[PDB]
């Protein structure tokens, strides 16, 4: 669910928080397998290269396991489900029979205390990782690799997933969370199930400050600027765009496509 | 527990060796969900009225069983996981209804 | 469903005497069994209103009896309830 508040202040009236009942003995995280210190910095070497960032709560980085072939065959028990501030999804601490501990992005359903495993073997149930080629066509899946052995990249956002649609050569055909139909190599690992914490999309920040906590500084409209600053600056009492709506740097921002045309990747795609 | 007849249609192009492979998992899954077999009728290949999986023919299997009813649904889901298992119809057993007699 | 010996168990346990297969309590108790069953079914299948209808009927019936019993014998009313956990 999602937590609501009686309006005992404005903003608290619309404010809505995440449900943390799914969260098992978190609080203190697992200092070992993560965390590392997280270098919080809003610009590159010198200059701001992404506007409107900075501030917001300090964070410890949980170094999660986005490649599971690392431990083929070795099963493991799910010890806890934890809060991770560095992603929308929740994380699951799992103890391997090895005695090795690793975090995984907690899939929807994944219960505390169940066994998990990865490999060409691997029962087709929730939490288990397999090379795409060995997953029954039609199953939903998450944390997919885009190229073999390069680590998961796709469907890692809270509530996201991907469907295996068919096979074609050493490639299988996924339908990515974006809706794009893509061919991915069969050797690429995926893990069965959707991501979970899917109520995520339904929280309401409620106030300006709430955005400040997440590290988002106020965003100012070109419309409020001067010509020096933005295509939309200037006028003299409000103003339509007076030209095709543009970004501070001049390019159009309503329709104009941006994907590089001649791109090797193009040969493996087929949708929106 | 209840008596269910269990119909399973398999890929016809499988070889006698594979066919046994696909048939051992059935039998284990059958046992893992709590089914105690009774009869059995492996009519084998059979001509189909319409192509299932683009294959005019299909290899048939038929089991009578007594399993806990609260696990029949799950069983069917499991039996179907195989690609060489192209259809399953679990049906609760019935005393035959006769005519002309 | 409530199986034969399953309901038999109850019949015997409440019978006012070996042979009693439909006294006030044996009925009340009997109903109580189905009610608690359905009540747990509806908790799961809540958009199943038709079945909930019967529930009301089984509940209403049970009440009528208990009102009769508490009218004729205010003793085995406490007794019956206490033993069943009813009237909240």
């Amino acid at each position: 669910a999602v937590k609501k508040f009686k309006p005992y202040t404005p903003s608290r009236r619309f404010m809505t928080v995440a449900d943390f009942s799914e969260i098992t003995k978190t609080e203190p995280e697992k200092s070992l397998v993560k965390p590392l210190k997280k270098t919080g910095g809003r610009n590159n070497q010198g200059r701001i290269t992404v506007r409107f960032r900075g501030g917001g709560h300090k964070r410890l980085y949980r170094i999660i396991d986005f490649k599971r072939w690392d431990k083929v065959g070795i099963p493991a028990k799910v010890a806890a489900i934890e809060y991770d501030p560095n992603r929308s999804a929740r994380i699951a601490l799992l103890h391997y029979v090895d005695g090795e501990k690793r975090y995984i992005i907690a899939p929807d359903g994944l219960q505390v205390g169940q066994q998990v495993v990865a490999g060409p073997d691997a029962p087709i149930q929730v939490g288990n990782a397999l090379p795409l080629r060995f997953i029954p066509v039609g199953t939903v899946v998450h944390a997919v690799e885009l190229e073999p052995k390069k680590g998961a990249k796709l469907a890692r956002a809270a509530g996201t997933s991907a469907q295996i649609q068919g096979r074609e050569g050493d490639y299988v055909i996924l339908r990515l969370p974006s809706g794009e139909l893509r061919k991915v190599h069969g050797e690429c690992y995926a893990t069965v199930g959707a991501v979970g914490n899917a109520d995520h999309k339904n929280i309401v920040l409620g106030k300006a400050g709430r955005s400040r906590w997440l590290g988002r500084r106020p965003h100012v409209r070109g419309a409020a600027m001067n010509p020096v600053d933005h295509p939309h600056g200037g006028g003299e009492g409000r103003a339509p765009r007076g030209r095709p709506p543009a970004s501070p740097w001049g390019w159009q921002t309503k329709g104009l496509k941006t994907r590089k045309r001649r791109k090797p990747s193009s040969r493996f795609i087929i949708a929106r | 527990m209840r008596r269910y007849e269990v119909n399973i249609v398999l890929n016809p192009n499988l070889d006698q060796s594979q066919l046994a492979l696909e048939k051992e998992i059935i039998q284990r899954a059958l046992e893992n969900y709590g089914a105690r077999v009774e009869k059995v009728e492996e009519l084998g290949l059979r001509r189909l009225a319409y192509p299932i999986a683009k294959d005019p023919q299909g290899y048939f299997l038929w089991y009578q069983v007594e399993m806990p009813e609260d696990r029949v649904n799950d069983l069917a889901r499991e039996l179907r996981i195989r690609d060489n298992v192209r259809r399953v119809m679990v049906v609760k057993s019935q005393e035959p209804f006769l005519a002309n007699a | 469903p409530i199986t034969k010996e399953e309901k038999q168990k109850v019949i015997q346990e409440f019978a006012r005497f070996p042979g009693d297969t439909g006294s006030t309590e044996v009925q009340v108790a009997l109903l109580t069994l189905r009610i608690n069953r359905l009540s747990e079914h509806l908790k799961v299948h809540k958009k199943d209103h038709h079945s909930h209808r019967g529930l009301l009927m089984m509940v209403g019936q049970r009440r009528r009896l208990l009102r009769y019993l508490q009218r004729e014998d205010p003793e085995r009313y406490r007794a019956l309830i206490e033993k069943l956990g009813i009237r909240g």
């Binding site: - | 119909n7 249609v9 059979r46 189909l48 009225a49 319409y50 299932i52 299909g58 038929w62 259809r87 119809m89 049906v91 019935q94 035959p96 209804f97 006769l98 005519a99 002309n100 007699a101 | -």
Partner: protein, 72 residues
């Protein structure tokens, strides 16, 4: 108009067994439809039992769902 009611065309059959085609495939038409009561000679109760099973067989792949009208 003519022909027999069919029920009087075969001996003692189990119209609950959805597996024996030959008995059943005679209750279908040229095109493949379930035959009306006025040609199966079955009763109210028997016609339901029949269809219910005729459907099952179809799913199984034994009985057809439809077939073309031959030589019109």
């Amino acid at each position: 108009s003519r022909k027999a009611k069919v029920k009087a065309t075969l001996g003692e059959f189990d119209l609950r067994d959805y597996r024996n085609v030959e008995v059943l495939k005679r209750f279908l038409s040229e095109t493949g439809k379930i035959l009306p009561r006025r040609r199966t000679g079955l009763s109210a109760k028997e016609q339901r039992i029949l269809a219910k099973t005729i459907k099952r067989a179809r799913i199984l792949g034994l009985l057809p769902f439809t077939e073309k009208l031959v030589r019109k």
